[PDB]
């Protein structure tokens, strides 16, 4: 139950492939980082993905 | 049932065919009626039963309503029943004569 | 609710012996407490109750034909009268 507050980016599922093309289920997780941002006009610490943080879309308090 | 208690009906079927008698009682659920002097049954009665005397007892037993037929008043002959509304009231009418059955 | 509280009188050999000692046995609602029974008896019969002893009887299995079932649970109150008397009959 961990997702970016701004983008809603979350872990995804897929396969890990060997050279012999054997497959094992794996996960790709978002680069979520806990940052203090302003939520509802009050400073709050939430998980935000680095992609969202890029270009200062999300203000950091 | 087209036949009602106290009607005088001819028996058109059974051993008692061709006998006319009053309807003593009617059983709606079973579609059977009792007619006087028709389908008399001899029933063994114990003296051990509440009635002090014990012997075979002869009483009328129910006969199917289809077997009995109402008698036309004019002709005293078997008639089917037809219903005609008079002054907002349904009246039993004999098919043979067209007169009110009762 | 006094009429509702006391369901019926109980007439048995042990009940009759109790009546000689001025103890009157009744079948009462299962929910009612003994204090409720005391007030109920006093209202209906206009007598003074010395004490009320109460018991619960479990449902008893009774068989008829192939059908198997249990009798109703019963709560029985034995009421001793300090003053006055009750005539069930």
């Amino acid at each position: 139950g961990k997702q970016c507050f701004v983008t809603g980016r979350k872990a995804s599922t897929g396969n890990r492939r060997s050279h012999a093309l054997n497959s094992t289920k794996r996960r790709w997780n978002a680069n979520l980082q806990k940052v203090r941002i302003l939520v509802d006009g009050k400073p709050k610490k939430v998980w935000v993905s680095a992609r969202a943080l890029k270009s200062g879309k999300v203000t950091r308090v | 049932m087209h036949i009602k208690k106290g009607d005088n009906v001819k028996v058109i079927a059974g051993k008692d065919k061709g006998k006319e008698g009053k309807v003593i009682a009617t059983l709606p659920k079973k579609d059977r009626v009792v007619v006087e002097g028709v389908n008399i049954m001899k029933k063994h009665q114990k003296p051990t039963q509440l009635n002090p005397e014990g012997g075979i007892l002869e009483t009328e037993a129910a006969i199917h309503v289809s077997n009995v037929q109402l008698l036309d008043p004019k002709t005293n002959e078997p008639t089917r029943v037809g219903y005609k509304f008079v002054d907002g009231k349904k009246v039993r009418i004999a098919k043979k004569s067209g007169e009110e059955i009762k | 609710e006094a009429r509702d509280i006391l369901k019926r009188p109980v007439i048995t050999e042990k009940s009759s012996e109790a009546m000689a000692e001025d103890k009157y046995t009744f079948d009462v609602d299962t929910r009612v407490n003994k204090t409720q029974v005391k007030m109920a008896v006093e209202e209906i019969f206009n007598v003074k109750v010395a004490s009320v002893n109460i018991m619960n009887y479990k449902p008893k299995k009774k068989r008829m034909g192939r059908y198997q079932g249990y009798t109703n649970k019963r709560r029985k109150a034995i009421v001793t009268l300090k003053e006055g008397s009750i005539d069930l009959f």
């Binding site: - | - | 009429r3 006391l6 019926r8 009188p9 209906i44 069930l88 009959f89």
Partner: protein, 65 residues
């Protein structure tokens, strides 16, 4: 008592009638247990009257609201 007659009774009259009818039922129940009651059908009649009395009373309270 038929509902029509009950409808004539005032709210106070109905209330008193319910109480009196309930007392009658209690007496009948005690008589039956002692084996002193022969007219068993009486019990049913009283019950339905009390039910009617209660029904008519309920209608009035709903009507008021």
């Amino acid at each position: 008592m038929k509902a029509k007659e009950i409808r004539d009774l005032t709210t106070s009259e109905i209330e008193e009638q319910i109480k009196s009818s309930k007392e009658e039922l209690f007496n009948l129940r005690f008589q039956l247990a002692t084996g002193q009651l022969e007219e068993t059908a009486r019990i049913r009649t009283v019950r339905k009257t009390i039910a009617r009395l209660k029904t008519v009373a309920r209608e009035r309270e709903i009507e008021q609201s």
